[PDB]
Structures are given as structure tokens and as C-alpha cells.
Design a protein around this ligand. Structure first.
Ligand SMILES: Cc1nnc2c(N)cc(C(=O)N3[C@H]4Cc5ccccc5[C@@H]3CNC4=O)cn12
Length: 130
């Protein structure tokens, strides 16, 4: 229905704003664009589901997220991919892992403070009905 499309449109607006706030954070720069296989050689073969903030925006705009839970699955993927690809004790790997975890924690904290749980419940119920 039109009321349901208004719900998903508000969800997209909310998701774009959260994504923009992550994207402008200096700590999260290396998560703003897809990992370039030319600059990071074995990446696209090791990481099966690459995910980054520009692809998250692309997915919002393509109406791929019908709930905040679906969006957060992709945020979790940015974090888990970095933990998998950079698992060593060296400072380089520890820094990207900390930034990846911080990106995921910031997204969850923004949503905890700003997302009305009845709004998410409505999105979940329209999705489950389709
Ligand atoms: C995410 C992630 N997960 N692992 C690594 C990694 N090992 C390196 C990089 C890394 O530093 N960047 C990547 C992605 C990127 C995107 C925007 C701006 C800079 C960068 C830099 C430069 N080029 C790249 O392809 C990122 N990673």
C-alpha cells in the first residue's frame, strides 16, 4: 500500500543519514569505497561478500533493505570481512580491526538511540507479509 511505501521511504531516509554519518567519520575512510583488488591483491578471492559504505548507499537506493535488521546484516559484514582478512597481531591489522569494530559499534549505538522499535517492528511486519 501507499502507507507501506511511505514507511519504507522513511526507513531509506533514516538508513542514508546513519550511513552518511559513518562515511564522514575519518576513522572509517577505508570502508567508504569497495576494496580495490589492484591495491589489495587476494581480497576478492578471500572475501566472498565484499561490503562497504558506498555499496550500502547503493543498496538503500535500490530498495534492498526493508528493515533495519537487513541493513545491520551488511554493517556486520563490513566488520566481519575486516576481522577475517586482517587477523594478524601486527599494528596494521589491529588498527583496521579496531576501526571495523568501531564502525559496527557506532552504527548499532546510533540505531539504539535514534530508532523507534515500533518503527522497526512495522517494517518487519510489512516485510513478513510480502
Ligand atoms: C576494508 C578493508 N579490509 N581490509 C583492508 C585492507 N587490508 C586495506 C584497505 C585499505 O587501506 N583501502 C582499500 C579500500 C579503501 C577505500 C577508500 C579509501 C581508501 C581505501 C584503502 C586503499 N585502497 C583500498 O582498496 C582496506 N581494507
Amino acid at each position: 500500500s501507499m502507507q507501506e511505501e511511505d514507511t519504507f521511504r522513511e526507513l531509506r531516509i533514516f538508513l542514508r543519514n546513519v550511513t552518511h554519518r559513518l562515511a564522514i567519520d575519518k576513522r572509517f575512510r577505508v570502508f567508504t569505497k569497495p576494496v580495490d583488488p589492484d591495491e589489495v591483491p587476494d581480497y576478492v578471492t578471500v572475501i566472498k561478500q565484499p561490503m562497504d559504505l558506498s555499496s550500502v548507499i547503493s543498496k538503500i537506493d535500490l530498495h534492498k533493505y526493508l528493515t533495519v535488521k537487513d541493513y545491520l546484516r551488511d554493517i556486520d559484514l563490513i566488520c566481519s570481512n575486516a576481522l577475517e582478512y586482517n587477523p594478524d597481531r601486527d599494528p596494521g591489522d589491529r588498527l583496521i580491526r579496531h576501526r571495523a569494530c568501531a564502525l559496527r559499534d557506532t552504527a548499532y549505538a546510533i540505531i539504539k538511540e535514534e530508532l523507534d522499535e515500533d518503527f522497526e517492528q512495522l517494517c518487519e511486519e510489512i516485510q513478513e507479509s510480502r
